Each structure stands twice: as structure tokens, then as C-alpha cells.
Design an enzyme around this catalytic site. Structure first.
Site, mmCIF file in Angstrom:
data_model
loop_
_atom_site.group_PDB
_atom_site.id
_atom_site.type_symbol
_atom_site.label_atom_id
_atom_site.label_comp_id
_atom_site.label_asym_id
_atom_site.label_seq_id
_atom_site.Cartn_x
_atom_site.Cartn_y
_atom_site.Cartn_z
ATOM 1 N N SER A 239 0.843 -1.185 0.000
ATOM 2 C CA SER A 239 0.000 0.000 0.000
ATOM 3 C C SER A 239 0.884 1.242 0.000
ATOM 4 C CB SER A 239 -0.949 0.002 1.204
ATOM 5 O OG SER A 239 -1.717 -1.188 1.252
ATOM 6 N N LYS A 240 0.238 2.409 -0.034
ATOM 7 C CA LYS A 240 0.964 3.673 -0.049
ATOM 8 C C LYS A 240 1.715 3.925 1.251
ATOM 9 C CE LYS A 240 -3.641 5.024 -1.561
ATOM 10 N NZ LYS A 240 -3.566 4.353 -2.889
ATOM 11 N N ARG A 241 1.277 3.318 2.356
ATOM 12 C CA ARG A 241 1.930 3.535 3.642
ATOM 13 C C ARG A 241 3.268 2.815 3.745
ATOM 14 N NH1 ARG A 241 -2.868 1.310 3.546
ATOM 15 N NH2 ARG A 241 -3.672 3.379 4.127
ATOM 16 N N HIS A 242 3.474 1.753 2.963
ATOM 17 C CA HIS A 242 4.761 1.067 2.968
ATOM 18 C C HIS A 242 5.845 1.881 2.275
ATOM 19 C CE1 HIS A 242 2.893 -2.757 4.328
ATOM 20 N NE2 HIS A 242 1.865 -2.318 3.625
ATOM 21 N N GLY A 243 5.467 2.774 1.369
ATOM 22 C CA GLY A 243 6.433 3.575 0.642
ATOM 23 C C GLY A 243 5.848 4.020 -0.687
#
Ligand SMILES: N[C@@H](CCC(=O)O)C(=O)O
Ligand SMILES: N[C@@H](CCC(=O)O)C(=O)O
Ligand SMILES: [Zn+2]
Ligand SMILES: [Zn+2]
Lengths: 468, 467
Positions: A239-243
């Protein structure tokens, strides 16, 4: 022969990293067997399939240089082709016309979910003798086979079996003339003659539904291979939170296409010996049987050092063509300075991303207004002009302007004049660069012209001359 | 050609990194051409030649596995050998016995500095007067006055010194002790040294050592002076730049293979290749490829060198070096996983052995309390039920493997429908105590089934504090 792969992404607004790896597996396989790679767009979702969303897909494909031989084809069109096959299947008996209302259809699903079953439409209208024809509105469905089962040898997941009793007679045309998504896939893979399907993992449930339709309308069924999902850092789906999650966000972050494509290949697929492959090297050694069924984690720290290697391994001219984009991001007047292919030779081993190279390079092309406050307090008044004035008038002594002549010229100072090497090189660095961090002194002051060298040395002399 | 290289460090207290690179080139040159690598000690400076200072050189060479064919020889010994050659050289016309007092030398040096370079005049070169019988004096060497001295340096090219700049240097003090420049010549002659590879600051002493070798009929060896190792600002390497002693890198958690590979790349360049084994450094090494320019020390690349060798070298060999840093962290390694297996787990995560000894105690020792921060996000009452089914499924398997562990965590988050991160992360915080670890398949497997339940129930006994 006629090996033809495909990449048919649904527009998400950008090109997901997982979707690019799927396109790479379909592109490498088409180039492995000398086949064709077809591009398709699933823009039936009219809200998220904006013109900017469709361009973000093709722009991401072009940056990775994943050129296609056929396409792109759009599902928002070809509706007349879709209804042409539906009318054909109605005549052959492979597809019937349902007359149940949405009230009875939702009452059927709530009764099966309550009874502990699977939501499937029973054959009430499959062989109905109840008339109700002509002018009355209706929907048409696909007569799914009742006997036996469908089994397809997945190159990634192995043999997968789906009983025909859990597959329903799926609807292929709604109340309006629009056809459903699954039917829009079987005819596209049929008209475009796709032989190998390489898509994501979550499309495995619709694979047996698509095969029973291709077998019905007499079509060469292709071999499927579903790639596992990409997991993030903690084991969850990427997801976007991983990078960074879009391929173009990596281009904004200062990455090379070869670095991203070489890392996405190593996610699942493996060759055992190597970790770095070239484009033509990935085409030869690629095998779908080598792609692992297990999900791979995303290690951003490894991808960064993968980018650092490609900066110094790729030809300096090609890395310069990608450095130009981030140079314009930093807004640098690159008229009076060294070449871009020669700039990556200087800042190569230092930084690990092109963004970090576009930054910390303005002093090679543009003049600086002020100095670094801490670096200015480093080269104070004592014995500052004595080594600077002798080295400034000694650099302009030669006519052949090379870094080799500069090194021995800077070697003259602090050797002919008894003093430490850091007592002249450090004030020289702050003079021509403005800060206290740069590559080799003999090479840094050579990329800077001999004019801007003495201009900035005398600039520091006018600055250190402020004891009043 | 019976090649013989040498490495004769002066005990500075430890083993300088720049000195290890010099020993590395001499060791490689001897092994490349099937020669011998000799070891010598310049322990004449009795103040800094402490028994602890000379041992730090010996074990530093053994840590890098730079074994020697001959030695170690000590300049403290062979003093009778040094006095036997000068007495033989005094019998010949190449060495005389000076008799000028210390007052005449200072008065002449201050006069020579006043006139149009301080060079001792040949006042005692051809004096027929005995001057004394056993009174204090100084023995010198008759330097040649005509011509020049030329030695083909393999790194710095051809260097020439005019013989008029070399004075009749002192080879024996008043107390009979010989000088340093003469001790090097006699040692390299009896040991049959064919190639000399030393630092850059000895380029001025090379022409003086050759004129003695040109005398007394001695084979003149080929010299090659490596350039100094500069720091971040261009000055010589010092403690302000970072680690300087070779043993400081073992304390900081490095491998001998990582340090030797990086020092080899400093100056000596062989194409795009960066990672060499010991046998590759023996083959591809070329003395001419060593650059005359000085190279700066990049601690960032050396850290990347060590990260590769941790996962490239055999895990059993890395476990032998990891043991030293486990003792630094004082970790009871009786109950946890094997050391060679521990390198497989923490391999791709950390880039130095100290970073591996740290962040691994939960594999071996139980933790008193959690990190709280990671617990506040994953020890909520919503996770008290995912933890009650994993422990009942982790014990259902008789064969305790990482694969059967994954299938146990896979049965969870499927029976109780929830994202897999909502069970593996509370399991990660309960087993490790924090929110960072390798894969859950190998993390809870290497720790054990017994210590798992003891830490899952430890979390269950803690997450039950909703009052
Ligand atoms: N458009 C689908 C793939 C459809 C297919 O390959 O059949 C996706 O992006 O996931
Ligand atoms: N002992 C000297 C080197 C002597 C030689 O190699 O000739 C040093 O440590 O720098
Ligand atoms: Zn119906
Ligand atoms: Zn005298």
C-alpha cells in the site's frame, strides 16, 4: 506459434508497482518467444478511468520502455462487437435470456447466503417455458455447463480445479444494452488471439468462468498464470503507507528504469545466481515456471542500492538523459558548466539517487550569492588569503586546462609553501563550491571553468577581508 | 626470480589501517609470484614499542589472516649483527669514523644555513689522523658524490636524486647504537628482499638506502611507495575521521574479508569489479595498477562491503566472528537458535555484526516488559482472540518447522476473518517485544514452541488490563 501475451489494467489513476511487474512478466514472455505484446484498457469504470488515469498507465509503460506491438484497445468501445457475440450465442443456444426481476434476484441471494450456500443463480430462466418475450425488457445470461468441471494448469499456482456446480450462469448483458465485464474479457482475449494470460492473483476466481465461455463459443482456451500479490514491509499487501507505490513516483524520487525493473523481476522470479540482469538478459533467462507462488516483501533499502549501482554501471550518457529531468526539477541553468554525462562521473559514487545528484550540484553551473555560515567560520582571516592568492594565480598559469595539471598545481601550494594540505584545499573548496563537502578538489575545480574559479576565489578574498 | 616482499612496521601502539594496506600489497605480491612474505619489527623506539603495542600488530595480522613465511624479526635483536657489518665496512673504504663534536656540527649547520642546505662536509672522509683511540665518536658512510641515483618506483614512476644532495649520513651514534636507515639496509640484504613496498614518507630515505646497497656489493631491490590514505577533508587519516585501528573495526562489528577487500580497492583499481575473494586478490593483483594519487576513505562503502560478506560468506564462518559481539552484548545463547542459523535470520537486515548482536536478545533471553509503543498499537483487546487460536494451532503440529508455523498462522486470520497483519503483528509484539523482526515464519520458529506460549500468555495476561 502465435504467442501473444496481454496487459489489461483497470485505470487506478496511476501505474501500480504490482501492475508494472505483471506487465513485465507478460512483456518478457512475449519477447522470450518472439511473440506480440498487446495493450488493453479496462475503462468500463467511467469514474476512475479518467483521461489522466489512462495516460498515467501508458506514460508509466513508456518510461520503463515496455513498448507494445498491438493496441491499446479500449473496453468503452467495441460494445457493438460485444453485442455481436451475445447475439451469436443466443442463436447457438449457449446463452439464454433471463426474465427475473431484481426483486427476485436479491431474494434468491439472501436465501442462499442464509441457507449456508454460495450465491449462484439457479436455472429458472435457463430453460423457461413461460413465454414473456419480445417487447418486455430483460437480461441475457450465459448457459454454464452443469456436468464435470474445468481444470487449468496454472504455471504459477499449479493445477487448479473448479467444479461446475459452484459456477453460476453469469449474466452477460444488463437491463440496458451494456455487457458485463467478464464477457468483455473473453471476446477480447479471443479476437486478439491471446495464448498466455499473466495477471494478478485475485483474478483466479474469474478464470474458470472465462474458460467455460471460451469453450462454449468455440475458442482456443489459453494457459493461465496468476502471479501472487506483493506484500509490504510487515507482511500486508503493498500500500501507499509502505512507501512509494506508483512507478512515476519513483521517477520523481530519482530512480532509473533499469533499477526498478531489475528489482520487480527479483520479486518472486529467481535465477539463483544473479541479482542484476540487463533488459536483453531478462528476456533470455525468464521462465514462468521459475516464478514463486509465495508472496515477496518490498525492501526499499535494497532498491536504493540497486539504483546506486545502475548510476555508475550504466553508460554516463544514458544516466545523464535521466538526470536532466531532476535538473529541471531543481531549476538549474546548465549553460555554463560541465557536461551532464561528465557530471554523473563526478557525483556517481557519492549519491544514490538522481534527485540527490540534481541537488548538491548547483555550484558547477550557477554562482552563489552567499557562503555557508558554518563553512565561512571555518576559513577565517588567519592564513586564508596567503594560500588562496598563490593557488588562484597558479591555476591560470597553464593553457591546457585539465584536472591532471590542476592536481600538481594545487600540489604546488601546501608543499612549496610549508603548510598542511587541508589548509589550502579546504579554503579552496569553500571558495569555489561555497560549502565544505564536494568530490576531489582537483576534479571539482576543473569542471568549474578557470574564469568562475578565480571569480569565486577572489570572492572569498573580498569576504575574508572584513576585519573592519 | 625468488621474489621476496616485506612488511616492517614501527610499533605505533596499534595497527593503522594504512599500515595494513601496505602489508596487504606486500603479502599479495609474494603470493602472486610464489614468493615469501617476511615480517620485521622496528622496535628501536623503546618508548612506544610496548609489549602490548607490539602484540597489537601480531594479532592484527592474524585477524586479517596475513600469515608470514619468515619472521617475526626484531631490530632490538641482531645488534651484534649491526655492529659486525659496520666494523667490516670500516675496514673497507666505503665507511669512515667521524670525530667532530656536537659543537662543531651545530656551528657548521648554523653556518651552512647562513650561507647559500645543511649537508655534512667530508672533513673526516679522508683524514689520516687517528684523532682518538677509544674516545667517543660517530661512524658514518661515505656517500658517492658524482652522478645521481635513479630508482624505478612501480607506483610513482621514475624518481631521481642528485648525489650532491645526499650527505654522509650517520650510521652509528656515540653510544654505539646504529641509526634507523642503516638497520633497514642490512635487514633487507640478509633477508634477500627483492621488492620493497612501503609508505610514501619513505621516498626520501630510498636514495640513501640504495647508495649503501650500491656499496658493499648488494642487489638493489625494486621499490614501490604507496600513497597515503587521506580522510574526508584531504588530510592524513586520524582518529577524528573515524576508526583507525584494524581492531577497532572488529569492535565495531566488521569481518576481515570486508576490510581487506576495501583496502585493496583504495588506489588499486581493476575494472568495474568491487568484490574479490582472497584468491582473486592474489591473481588479479598488479603492482602497476596501484594509482599514484591518494584516495579518500569512504566509510559508507565499507559498510556496504560488510553487508555483502555477511550474506555471501558461509553462515558457519560468520557465526565464528558473530560470537565475539554476542559476548559484548552479554547474551545467554544457551536456549535460542544456532549462531550459524542466526546469521541466516538477521542477515539481510543489519550491515554489521554489532548490529546483529544487538536486536537479537529476544531469541535467547526473555524480556521483562514490552516496548509499550508497539504494544499500544497491537496489544489492544481486539487482538486477544487472534492470540488464543495461534497458540492452540502452533502446538497442534508435531513437526516444528517454519513451514508448519506459517500454515498455523494461515489457519488463523482465515477461521477468524481478519487481515493477516492483524494477527502476525500482535504475535510479533508478543514474541519479540517490539515491532521489528524477520519473517514471523522463522521468528517464532527459532525461538521455540515453549517460549512462544510463555510469551503469548504473557501478552494475554497483560492485554487483560482493560479495567
Ligand atoms: N484489469 C485487471 C486485469 C484483467 C485481466 O488481466 O483479465 C487488473 O488490472 O487487475
Ligand atoms: N617501519 C616503517 C616502514 C619501514 C619500511 O618499510 O622500510 C613504518 O612503519 O612506516
Ligand atoms: Zn431468471
Ligand atoms: Zn667529523
Amino acid at each position: 506459434m502465435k504467442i501473444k501475451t496481454r496487459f489489461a489494467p483497470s485505470p487506478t489513476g496511476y501505474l501500480h508497482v504490482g501492475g508494472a511487474r505483471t506487465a513485465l512478466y507478460s512483456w518478457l514472455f512475449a519477447r522470450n518467444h518472439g511473440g506480440e505484446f498487446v495493450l488493453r484498457i479496462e475503462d468500463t469504470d467511467l469514474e476512475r478511468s479518467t483521461p489522466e488515469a489512462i495516460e498515467a498507465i501508458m506514460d508509466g509503460m513508456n518510461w520503463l520502455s515496455l513498448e507494445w506491438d498491438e493496441g491499446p484497445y479500449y473496453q468503452t468501445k467495441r460494445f457493438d462487437r460485444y453485442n455481436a457475440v451475445i447475439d451469436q450465442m443466443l442463436e447457438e443456444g449457449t446463452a439464454y435470456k433471463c426474465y427475473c426481476s431484481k426483486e427476485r434476484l436479491e431474494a434468491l441471494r439472501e436465501e442462499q447466503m442464509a441457507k449456508g450456500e454460495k450465491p449462484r443463480y439457479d436455472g429458472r430462466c435457463r430453460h423457461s417455458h413461460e413465454h414473456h418475450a419480445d417487447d418486455e425488457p430483460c437480461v441475457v445470461r450465459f448457459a454454464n455447463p452443469q456436468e464435470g468441471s474445468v481444470v487449468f494448469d496454472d504455471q504459477i499456482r499449479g493445477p487448479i480445479e473448479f467444479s461446475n456446480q459452484e459456477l453460476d450462469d453469469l449474466i452477460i448483458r444488463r437491463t440496458d444494452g451494456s455487457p458485463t465485464y467478464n464477457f468483455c474479457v473473453v471476446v477480447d482475449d479471443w479476437d486478439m488471439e491471446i495464448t498466455h494470460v499473466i495477471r494478478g492473483e485475485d483474478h483466479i476466481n474469474n478464470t474458470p468462468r472465462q474458460i467455460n465461455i471460451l469453450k462454449a463459443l468455440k475458442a482456443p482456451v489459453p494457459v493461465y498464470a496468476h502471479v501472487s500479490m506483493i506484500n509490504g514491509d510487515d507482511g500486508e499487501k503493498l500500500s501507499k503507507r509502505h512507501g512509494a507505490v506508483s512507478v512515476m513516483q519513483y521517477r520523481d524520487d530519482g530512480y532509473l528504469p533499469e533499477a526498478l525493473l531489475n528489482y520487480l523481476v527479483r520479486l518472486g522470479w529467481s535465477h539463483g545466481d544473479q541479482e542484476i540482469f540487463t533488459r536483453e538478459e531478462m528476456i533470455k533467462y525468464f521462465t514462468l515456471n521459475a516464478v514463486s507462488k509465495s508472496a515477496s516483501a518490498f525492501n526499499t533499502d535494497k532498491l536504493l542500492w540497486l539504483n546506486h549501482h545502475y548510476i555508475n554501471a550504466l553508460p554516463p550518457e544514458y544516466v545523464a538523459t535521466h538526470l536532466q529531468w531532476h535538473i529541471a526539477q531543481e531549476n538549474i541553468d546548465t549553460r555554463n558548466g560541465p557536461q551532464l554525462a561528465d557530471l554523473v562521473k563526478l557525483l556517481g559514487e557519492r549519491c544514490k539517487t538522481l534527485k540527490e545528484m540534481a541537488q548538491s550540484c548547483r555550484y558547477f553551473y550557477e554562482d552563489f550569492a552567499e557562503f555557508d555560515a558554518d563553512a565561512a567560520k571555518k576559513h577565517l582571516r588567519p592564513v586564508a588569503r596567503q594560500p588562496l592568492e598563490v593557488v588562484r594565480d597558479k591555476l591560470a598559469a597553464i593553457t591546457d586546462w585539465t584536472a591532471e595539471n590542476v592536481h600538481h598545481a594545487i600540489q604546488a601550494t601546501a608543499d612549496e609553501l610549508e603548510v598542511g594540505m587541508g589548509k589550502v584545499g579546504m579554503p579552496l573548496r569553500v571558495a569555489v563550491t561555497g560549502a565544505g563537502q564536494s568530490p576531489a578538489l582537483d576534479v571539482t575545480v576543473h569542471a568549474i571553468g578557470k574564469t568562475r574559479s578565480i571569480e569565486r576565489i577572489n570572492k572569498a578574498l573580498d569576504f575574508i577581508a572584513e576585519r573592519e
